[PDB]
Every structure is written in C-alpha cells, then in structure tokens.
Symmetry: none
Subunit: 82 residues, 2 copies
C-alpha cells in the first residue's frame, strides 16, 4: 500500500501551492510539515496528472500549480509555516 | 517542456535503480550528477508509472524498482474469433 499514502499527502502540498506557487521543496515542506523526500515525491503524484508543472531558473527547482492555467485563488490569506 | 526534461532525468535515476536500487535520494543524487530536489522529482516521474516503491524505514525513505514486484503482467484481451 503506497498510492493511497502518496495520494493523501499530495493534496496537502498542492493546497499550499494554491496560496502561492513557484516554491522550492524544503520551504514548501515547512508549511505542510512533511519530510523533504516525502514532499518532492508527493508532488510527483501531482506530476502524474500535471496538477504541478516544473520550471528551473538559475538551476533552482520551482513547483507551479495547474490553477494558473485555468482557475487559482489565494483567498485563504497565507498559511504560515512551522 | 517540463515532462520532456523530467522524462530524460527519470531515465538516468531509474538506470541507477536497475543496477543498485533501495538507495536514499541524496546518495542517488550524487551518483546521477543531480541535486536532491531534481533527483526526487525525477523519481516522481517514475512514481506516475509505479516504477518506484517508497519505503519509510525508521522515518527514512528508500526507493526500490518495479523489478521486485513482477505483477505488471495480465490476461489477454478476450475477443470473438472470426
């Protein structure tokens, strides 16, 4: 059992992108409170359906939300990290 | 060309799994000349074809290959003979 785990935690990392996307793995990991390997791999489950799209600027890894194509809303006023 | 890039880099990280899998993401990253983020994201392109098995041992995440679970076969597509 693996696709149920990565299916569950992928919703939480994707939710933090709806706030503000173009964010790196360990920064995103502090808001969602997942391990760096767990956060990147949860985003990999989103990449399956292109719920995320990847850009590399200056060698850095950006994670974009699919919402900036169709519909996205930062109506939830910024989820602070831990 | 996000899927073109991650498709190339996933073939590189999976090639490393074909000869030595069940390895941690940063160790694998140093082998495939990529960063931890880039490697785990390329392993995410393997996860969308279930080519990797994600095993959290004492909290530590290891990624095995699909070659251990050889249940990727099935039954012939049954059709009428004519």
């Amino acid at each position: 059992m693996d696709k149920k785990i990565v299916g569950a935690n992928a919703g939480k990392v994707w939710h933090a992108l709806n706030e503000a996307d173009g964010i790196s793995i360990p920064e995103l990991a502090r808001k969602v409170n997942l391990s760096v390997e767990s956060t990147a791999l949860a985003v990999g489950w989103l990449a399956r359906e292109n719920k995320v799209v990847i850009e590399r600027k200056n060698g850095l890894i950006e994670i974009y939300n699919e919402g900036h194509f169709d519909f996205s809303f930062g109506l939830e006023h910024h989820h602070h990290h831990h």
